[PDB]
């Protein structure tokens, strides 16, 4: 007896063909299908920041000496101080960048899951109820073709509205 | 009619502008402003700083007192402007550490 459960505090190790998807349970059995548009929408954003972190070319030629074999004093103290200042500032930039990036990546992938859920919520209208775990209880008989119509966005709520409302109340 | 429809929306413009974000090289937004000043009039405004135009004279020449720089005696400035056309016309001279003397007089 395995009941299905959604994304509320729960991932799917079994889904390998996409990043987001649907799992259903109806009269014909249980099934799973990935959602390609939302999977790629999250991937496209990660690709875009991968492109932007590498876009600048840092091309330097003749610079200053950074290693010294003899103690010299004032001028060498200054050359070392300049390079140590540059490294600490770039190290800070690198640390802050990946922190802002990862925070945003976690947010945008969490957002795609919510968008897909709300997109589904709008389709079902008064024919389903939020079970609270990331799943919908569809209050009418919904065969495989009916599940696919929800997955591909052609589900017409008026066809089943009378049946669904009678089961709800 | 027994029912009604109420839509919520936002404005749009025919031709928007491209901007960059963390993830996207170009996003079309309705409007943008430029943050990089890239143009000039070609002229130095004489206010509010006191600009002293060297004309034919370098600061070191006016310090020493080259005859055609006599007009600069006892002068003051916030910014001294040296021109390419400048030239010396007195005794040939050499200043060891010329850049340092120029810096401390100019400062």
């Amino acid at each position, epitope marked *: 007896f395995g009941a299905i459960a959604g994304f509320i505090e729960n991932g799917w190790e079994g889904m390998i063909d996409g990043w987001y998807g649907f799992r259903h349970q109806n009269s014909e059995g249980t099934g799973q299908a990935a959602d390609l548009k939302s999977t*790629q929408a999250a991937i496209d954003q*990660i690709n875009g920041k*991968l492109n932007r972190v590498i876009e600048k070319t840092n091309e330097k030629f003749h610079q200053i000496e950074k290693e010294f074999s003899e103690v010299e004093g004032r001028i060498q103290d200054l050359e070392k101080y300049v390079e140590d200042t540059k490294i600490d500032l770039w190290s800070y930039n690198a640390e802050l960048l990946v922190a802002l990036e990862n925070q945003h990546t976690i947010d945008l992938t969490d957002s795609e899951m919510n968008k897909l859920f709300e997109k589904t919520r709008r389709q079902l209208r008064e024919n389903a109820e939020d079970m609270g775990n990331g799943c919908f209880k569809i209050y009418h008989k919904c065969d495989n073709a009916c599940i696919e119509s929800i997955r591909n966005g052609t589900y017409d709520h008026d066809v089943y509205r009378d049946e669904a409302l009678n089961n709800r109340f | 009619n027994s029912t009604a429809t109420l839509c919520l929306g936002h404005h749009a413009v025919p031709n928007g502008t491209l901007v960059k974000t963390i993830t996207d090289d170009q996003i079309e937004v309705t409007n943008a402003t430029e943050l990089v000043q890239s143009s000039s009039t070609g002229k130095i405004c004489n206010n509010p700083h006191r600009i002293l135009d060297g004309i034919d004279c370098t600061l070191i020449d006016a310090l020493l007192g080259d005859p055609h720089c006599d007009v600069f005696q006892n002068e003051t400035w916030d910014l001294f402007v040296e021109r390419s056309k400048a030239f010396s016309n007195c005794y040939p001279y050499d200043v060891p550490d010329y850049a340092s003397l120029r810096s401390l007089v100019a400062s």
Partner: antibody
Amino acid sequence: QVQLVQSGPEVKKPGASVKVSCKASGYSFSRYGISWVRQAPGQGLEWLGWISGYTGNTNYAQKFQGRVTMTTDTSTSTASMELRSLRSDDTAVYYCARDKKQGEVVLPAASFRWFAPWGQGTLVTVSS
Amino acid sequence: DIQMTQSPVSLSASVGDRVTITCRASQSIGKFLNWYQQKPGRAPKLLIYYASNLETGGPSRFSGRGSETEFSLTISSLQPEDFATYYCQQSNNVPHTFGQGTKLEIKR
């Protein structure tokens, strides 16, 4: 190996619509996209648009927006390009080319953001 | 649209020559610049992808360099097969834009 095979040449009247097809083999169709490039007689190359074999998403060049619609079919590994309200301006050789990897995050040097391989080309002539 | 400017538009050279053609972008495109070779009656073929990468099976004499706004394609030693038209193309932003092309012609 990896190959794109296009439909035969077409001749059309100014008001009409043309539909070019691109048949793929040698790779997973649904993991990449297809871009469309045309070349007027004695002229340079011009990009029309792109469609993903993974999602069906499309990007059209602004000047063909409204006029073009690109479709893809995973079951037959075929992408199509429809151009409407033709003109003598549209007389050109139309190419399809595999473009952009899909279904996974890719570093730039592995993004396949380049046109390869190309189809043999489809010649479209529009004249009254 | 990002404007790609190729220099020169025409070039005359002999077999065995070393030639370099230049691609310029109106704004930075990173390394998303591709090079295509087109022989007169044939479709274009990819030669260099992502600025410096030789397409598999491509001749070793072809090499590419550059980043951001400046790019170049080099042929170490010209061959009879290499007299053709060469286009650079940017893939960083949509719409994808091509250069006007460089035609390699036989010197005489």
